[PDB]
Assembly symmetry: D2
Homo-oligomer: 70 residues x 4
């Protein structure tokens, strides 16, 4: 009751989607880490409240730069 044909279809389909998305995941991982190190160095938080809070603000800014498609 376990389709050995749909299974190898999905495995191959999942693997190829993984491979196809490599350049995007790498690109956006690089840029996220750069973005967060840049925005920290250009205006470092000091206290816990400001560090957590700035973390949240720059998460939103990174998102807006990712809902804009570049």
């Amino acid at each position: 009751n376990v389709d050995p044909h749909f299974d190898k279809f999905m495995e191959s389909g999942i693997r190829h989607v993984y491979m196809l998305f490599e350049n995007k995941s790498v690109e956006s991982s690089e840029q996220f880490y750069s973005f967060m190190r840049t925005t920290y160095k250009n205006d470092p938080c000091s206290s816990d409240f400001e560090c957590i809070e700035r973390g949240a603000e720059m998460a939103q800014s990174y998102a807006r730069i990712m809902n804009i498609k570049l």
Copy 2:
């Protein structure tokens, strides 16, 4: 030599980006699985060669539907 202030900045920033991307990851995970079950049921592969090969073709089609932004 380990910045306890940049660390909590990044942790908060990573967590909030995780939360912000929830709806996208869920949406595209749902659709991927639906897309692959739909395209299998509407034209099932039979053999290993065709199952692997159709898996690769529909991976590309899913990608094209994801580089088009809807």
Copy 3:
């Protein structure tokens, strides 16, 4: 003020971690989808409440099978 040497270090490091994790992401993606189709077919939810609720319960069961390391 942008280290062109740490950058290519990270890009290469991110790409190779992506490649190394391929078999795990594929394996656990396959099994998640199988697990969820199996547990649905062996006891299908009917209503919205039960569908959402069973979705949550089997998410926890999948997790327990993933905190056990097999």
Copy 4:
């Protein structure tokens, strides 16, 4: 021909697995970035060849520290 009941089961199941994996994805994202900045600062690559190559070596070391389960 589109099961509106299995769909909401999967959506809920995918969302809850996303939520459950939050602490792991955050933890391992934090540590990856720290690990890679630490290993760069404690022995920086200089040239392209060494930067790409060290990137690959520390990807493997991060992996071994992740196949060991801590």
